[PDB]
Amino acid sequence: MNPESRVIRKVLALQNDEKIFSGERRVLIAFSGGVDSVVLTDVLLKLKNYFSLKEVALAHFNHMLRESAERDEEFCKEFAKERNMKIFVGKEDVRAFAKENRMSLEEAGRFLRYKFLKEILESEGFDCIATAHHLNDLLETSLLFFTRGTGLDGLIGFLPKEEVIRRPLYYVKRSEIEEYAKFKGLRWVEDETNYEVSIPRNRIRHRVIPELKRINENLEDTFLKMVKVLRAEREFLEEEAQKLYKEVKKGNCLDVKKLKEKPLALQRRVIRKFIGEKDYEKVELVRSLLEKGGEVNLGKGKVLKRKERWLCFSPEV
Amino acid sequence: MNPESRVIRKVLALQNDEKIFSGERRVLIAFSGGVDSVVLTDVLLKLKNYFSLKEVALAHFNHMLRESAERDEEFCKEFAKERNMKIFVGKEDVRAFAKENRMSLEEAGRFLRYKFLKEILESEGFDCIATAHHLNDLLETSLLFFTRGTGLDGLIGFLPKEEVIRRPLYYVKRSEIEEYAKFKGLRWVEDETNYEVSIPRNRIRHRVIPELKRINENLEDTFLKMVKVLRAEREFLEEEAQKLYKEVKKGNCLDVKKLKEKPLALQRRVIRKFIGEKDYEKVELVRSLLEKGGEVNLGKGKVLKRKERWLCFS
Ligand SMILES: Nc1ncnc2c1ncn2[C@@H]1O[C@H](COP(=O)(O)OP(=O)(O)OP(=O)(O)O)[C@@H](O)[C@H]1O
Ligand SMILES: Nc1ncnc2c1ncn2[C@@H]1O[C@H](COP(=O)(O)OP(=O)(O)OP(=O)(O)O)[C@@H](O)[C@H]1O
Ligand SMILES: N[C@@H](CCCC[NH3+])C(=O)O
């Protein structure tokens, strides 16, 4: 099996399993100019009719942080022309939105790259946005949430398809993306967060994963099976969660007595939703009010009390 | 708060949260001679009456692997004599046992160790075994499972109470254990197995975890919160998985019709229980029969066929 089919087989597999494209007609690619983006594009133009797409276009965002960005942008317009594709370029100063909004260069650009994409989508009439997220991004992300503290959501990471976003390379490993770009002799722009190990994701990618791989070289593959199991168990619990939530709220309060003899796993999913907080301690606080009567203060004036069959928000302040 | 009250309260909290001890009278301690063993022993002797324990004793296994072995065994007896405790000591040639049985060394020791402990437990009339596992073993354990492939079970790691085994320092960090020992002026044996990054556990312990704490210095406490959550979620899934295994398994079959209209999460759970295998692959091969005709060959004669309304065996 060659590098081409090794990627295309996984993309088709993903399509089967998740129905990545099932009616969408116009696709907008979150094109960065990077290998994964280039390979993402090469694969979609090769499957354009297979997916019954009417049009595939690029959308590049110039964060204006580095100097190369000016050059990265040139590559993208060129690439688009070599492909005879439509492309929308966007220029914004993260740094000047991440300063006048208290933001890390990163987070601020994320918001902006997306705003522009949502923009390009709803305005130009595209049905969805395709991203180049791949299996290693999911490994790093998942491991980050594990590090930062989390539950199933973080362990699952992002999904192959969520609302308006589609991630065709979800099953593909970075090395497979790399091998395919070389095999087909594609050109792209290098990785210049190439080792700014000061950022967690990058520390995980360059210093953690390589160690874990010294334990299990097929970590990514082994990692994928675990996510499939968890996604399902999560889906189920979240499903049961709504069952109980509604089985439980009255308007603006929660029925302690009914929720008191329900499974802990579920009580916690319910509280989490009632209060709009995922923090473990805040959850336990509110949970304690199920047996004990009284008050608990969470944060933005989120104060909850027990009437006595009920557990509500205090209206004060 | 001092290094002692710090650890003591976490043990009292684990006891309050899990009922570690609740009728046991004679505890046998899996005593390695290392810090954790030593702090475990010191905490049980101090909380003996509180837990209503009639006796606490030490069990030390000489793996015969390291050169200090003999010496350490001696320290162990002296540690016992010092606190006027019984000490049972087992010795076996792990090394050899592995070669005449096809076992690496991790497994060999493990096998003989626990075997030795269960024998003392029975021939000495002990109710349970107290191990010195701690939160950092848990964190190292769960990362090993996340690396080798796993589900909730692996992520959760060992539990505070599992059968005959007890783990009173489950909530305690290795750092707290080390401060405890210095504070109370305790003596212990050197862990000459830190090094060897060849051992995955140590590679995680020395290379992986350190990098993670540079992202979150509170990794262990944060990991614990995650475990508690995962545990109750896992409890609910297994319970719901029991109901379904009973609502669908009628004989040596599974009511496809009923099991096909239920949650994937559960299906796999039902399948896993039915076919006795747990790996993702077999379960999914078997799982397709709920939708496609045919039969499957998993292991040693483990083959299942799909009838019109039933997924039974051959
Ligand atoms: N300059 C860009 N213009 C448009 N889209 C981009 C650009 N950079 C990245 N993307 C899109 O976002 C995806 C993820 O990129 P990257 O991992 O660098 O962002 P992150 O912010 O680091 O990740 P996430 O997007 O997971 O936060 C890329 O694969 C691509 O689909
Ligand atoms: N030589 C020994 N004699 C008796 N008990 C021991 C000995 N070594 C270890 N133990 C017990 O086993 C527990 C776990 O030890 P450790 O985790 O270092 O070994 P492992 O091989 O990693 O064990 P597991 O695989 O059970 O974690 C120790 O806390 C102690 O209670
Ligand atoms: N260096 C640590 C660990 C030594 C081995 C402990 N069993 C200490 O002595 O505190």
**Reduced DSSP (H G I as helix, E B as strand, rest coil) percent helix, strand, coil of chain A, to 5:** 50, 15, 35
In the three-class reduction of DSSP (H, G, I as helix; E, B as strand; rest coil), residue A306 is classed as strand
Q: Residue B117: which residues within 8 A CB-CB, separation 6 or more?
A: B28, B30, B59, B61, B129
**How far is C-alpha A149 from the chain's CA centre?**
17
B80, B193: one domain: yes
Instruction: Please say whether the beta carbons of B19 and B160 come within 8 A.
Output: no
B205, B87: one domain: yes
Q: What separation, in Å, do the N-terminal and C-terminal C-alpha atoms of chain A show?
A: 66
Measure the CA–CA gap between B60 and B92, rounded to whole angstroms.
12
Unique residue bearing structure tokens 């964190």: B139
Number of Cβ within 10 Å of residue B285's Cβ equals: 16
Residue A255 forms beta bridges with which residues?
A: A310
CATH number of the domain that A201 lies in? Answer: 3.40.50.620
For B211, name the nearest residue in chain A, comparing CA atoms only. A208
Measure the CA–CA gap between A317 and B3, rounded to whole angstroms.
42
Number of Cβ within 10 Å of residue B179's Cβ equals: 16
Measure the CA–CA gap between B263 and B240, rounded to whole angstroms.
10
Edge-to-edge strand ranges of the sheet holding A128-130: A86-91, A55-62, A26-30, A128-130, A165-166, A161-162
In the three-class reduction of DSSP (H, G, I as helix; E, B as strand; rest coil), residue A281 is classed as helix
Q: What is the 3-state secondary structure (H, E, C) of A200-254?
A: HHHHHHHHHHHHHCCCCCCHHHHHHHHHHHHHHHHHHHHHHHHHHHHCCEECCEE
Q: What is the 3-state secondary structure (H, E, C) of chain B?
A: CCHHHHHHHHHHHHHHHHCCCCCCCEEEEECCCCHHHHHHHHHHHHCCCCCCCCEEEEEEEECCCCCCHHHHHHHHHHHHHHCCCCEEEEECCHHHHHHCCCCCHHHHHHHHHHHHHHHHHHHCCCCEEECCCCHHHHHHHHHHHHHHCCCHHHHHCCCCEECCEECCCCCCCHHHHHHHHHHCCCCCCCCCCCCCCCCHHHHHHHHHHHHHCCCCCCHHHHHHHHHHHHHHHHHHHHHHHHHHHHHHECCCCEEHHHHCCCCHHHHHHHHHHHHCCCCHHHHHHHHHCCCCCEEEECCCCCEEEECCCEEEEC
Number of Cβ within 10 Å of residue A217's Cβ equals: 10
Six token digits for residue A119: 């923009």
Instruction: Please say whether the beta carbons of B258 and B309 come within 8 A.
Output: no
Q: Which ranges in A247-315 belong to alpha helices (H)?
A: 256-259, 264-275, 280-288
Q: Judging by DSSP bridges, how do beta strands B128-130 and B165-166 pair with one another?
A: parallel
Q: How many CB pairs below 8 A link A and B?
A: 111
Measure the CA–CA gap between A157 and B146, rounded to whole angstroms.
14
Edge-to-edge strand ranges of the sheet holding B311-313: B294-297, B303-306, B311-313
Measure the CA–CA gap between B41 and B34, rounded to whole angstroms.
11
For residue A234, the enclosing domain spans: 218-317
Give the phi and the psi of residue A53 in degrees, each rounded to 5: -90, 140
**A186: which DSSP letter?**
-
Number of Cβ within 10 Å of residue B159's Cβ equals: 15
Centroid of ligand 2 to alpha carbon of B181 (angstroms): 18
Overall domain count for chain B = 2
Closest CA to A129 of A159, A164, A170: A164
Unique residue bearing structure tokens 């489950």: B170
Residue A312 forms beta bridges with which residues?
A: A253, A305
Measure the CA–CA gap between B73 and B68, rounded to whole angstroms.
9
CATH number of the domain that A294 lies in? Answer: 1.20.59.20
Q: Give the C-alpha distances (Å, rounded to integers) separating A134 from A214, A220, B107, B150.
A: 21, 10, 37, 20
In the three-class reduction of DSSP (H, G, I as helix; E, B as strand; rest coil), residue A197 is classed as coil
Six token digits for residue B111: 């096998």
Contacts of B222 in chain A (CB under 8 A): 148-149
Measure the CA–CA gap between A57 and A36, rounded to whole angstroms.
16
B25, B153: one domain: yes
Task: Report the amino acid identity of residue B60.
Answer: H
B209, B131: one domain: yes
Instruction: Please say whether the beta carbons of A270 and A241 come within 8 A.
Output: yes
Residue in A63, A70, A113 to alter for ligand 1 test, most ligand atoms within 8 A of Cβ: A113
In the structure, which protein residues have their CB atom closer than 6 angstroms to any atom of ligand 3?
B 34-35, 178, 188-191
By Cβ distance, the residue of B211, B236, B237 closest to A208 is B211
Q: Residue B27: which residues within 8 A CB-CB, separation 6 or more?
A: B21, B44, B53, B55, B56, B57, B126, B127, B128, B129, B130, B166
Closest-CA residue, ligand 1 atom 24, reads A110
Closest CA to A132 of A173, A167, A87, A174: A167
A145, A251: one domain: no
Q: Judging by DSSP bridges, how do beta strands A165-166 and A128-130 pair with one another?
A: parallel
B190, B276: one domain: no
Cβ separation B215–A204 shorter than 8 A: yes
Last residue of a domain, one of B184, B217, B250: B217
Instruction: Please say whether the beta carbons of B309 and B256 come within 8 A.
Output: yes
Method by which the coordinates were obtained: X-ray
Instruction: Please say whether the beta carbons of B151 and B283 come within 8 A.
Output: no
Number of Cβ within 10 Å of residue A256's Cβ equals: 18
In the three-class reduction of DSSP (H, G, I as helix; E, B as strand; rest coil), residue A284 is classed as helix
Instruction: Please say whether the beta carbons of A261 and A254 come within 8 A.
Output: no
Q: Residue B259: which residues within 8 A CB-CB, separation 6 or more?
A: B244, B248, B267, B270, B290, B311
Q: Binding site membership of A for ATP: which residues? A: 32-37
Measure the CA–CA gap between A25 and A7, rounded to whole angstroms.
23
Overall size of chain A counted in residues: 317
Measure the CA–CA gap between B258 and A200, rounded to whole angstroms.
46
A198: exposed, middle or buried (C-beta count within 10 Å: 0-12, 13-18, 19+)? exposed
A179, A134: one domain: yes
In the three-class reduction of DSSP (H, G, I as helix; E, B as strand; rest coil), residue A148 is classed as helix
Measure the CA–CA gap between B129 and B58, rounded to whole angstroms.
10
B212, B201: one domain: yes
Last residue of a domain, one of A199, A217, A235: A217
Unique residue bearing structure tokens 């909850």: A304
Q: Give the C-alpha distances (Å, rounded to integers) separating B24 from B51, B54, B126, B129.
A: 9, 9, 9, 10
Number of Cβ within 10 Å of residue B184's Cβ equals: 16
Centroid of ligand 3 to alpha carbon of B110 (angstroms): 22
A74, A183: one domain: yes
Last residue of a domain, one of A166, A200, A217: A217
Instruction: Please say whether the beta carbons of A63 and A113 come within 8 A.
Output: yes
Instruction: Please say whether the beta carbons of B38 and B181 come within 8 A.
Output: yes
Six token digits for residue B292: 């496609």
A54: exposed, middle or buried (C-beta count within 10 Å: 0-12, 13-18, 19+)? exposed
Torsion of CA A24, A25, A26, A27, to 10 degrees: 50
Cβ separation A148–B208 shorter than 8 A: no
Centroid of ligand 1 to alpha carbon of A158 (angstroms): 13
In the three-class reduction of DSSP (H, G, I as helix; E, B as strand; rest coil), residue A55 is classed as strand
**How far is C-alpha A82 from the chain's CA centre?**
30
Measure the CA–CA gap between B181 and B10, rounded to whole angstroms.
16
A28, A132: one domain: yes
Measure the CA–CA gap between B42 and B172, rounded to whole angstroms.
14
Measure the CA–CA gap between A43 and A5, rounded to whole angstroms.
10
Closest CA to B165 of B28, B60, B36: B28
Q: Give the C-alpha distances (Å, rounded to integers) separating B118 from A179, B95, B98.
A: 53, 21, 20
B222, B202: one domain: no
Residue B294 forms beta bridges with which residues?
A: B306
Q: Return the half-sphere exposure (C-beta side, CA atoms, 13 A cut-off) of residue A256.
A: 18
Q: Judging by DSSP bridges, how do beta strands B161-162 and B165-166 pair with one another?
A: antiparallel
Closest CA to A57 of A30, A21, A91, A39: A30
B150, B294: one domain: no
Six token digits for residue A263: 């499974």
Measure the CA–CA gap between A237 and B238, rounded to whole angstroms.
12
Strands (E), chain A: 26-30, 55-62, 86-91, 128-130, 161-162, 165-166, 249-250, 253-255, 295-297, 303-306, 310-313
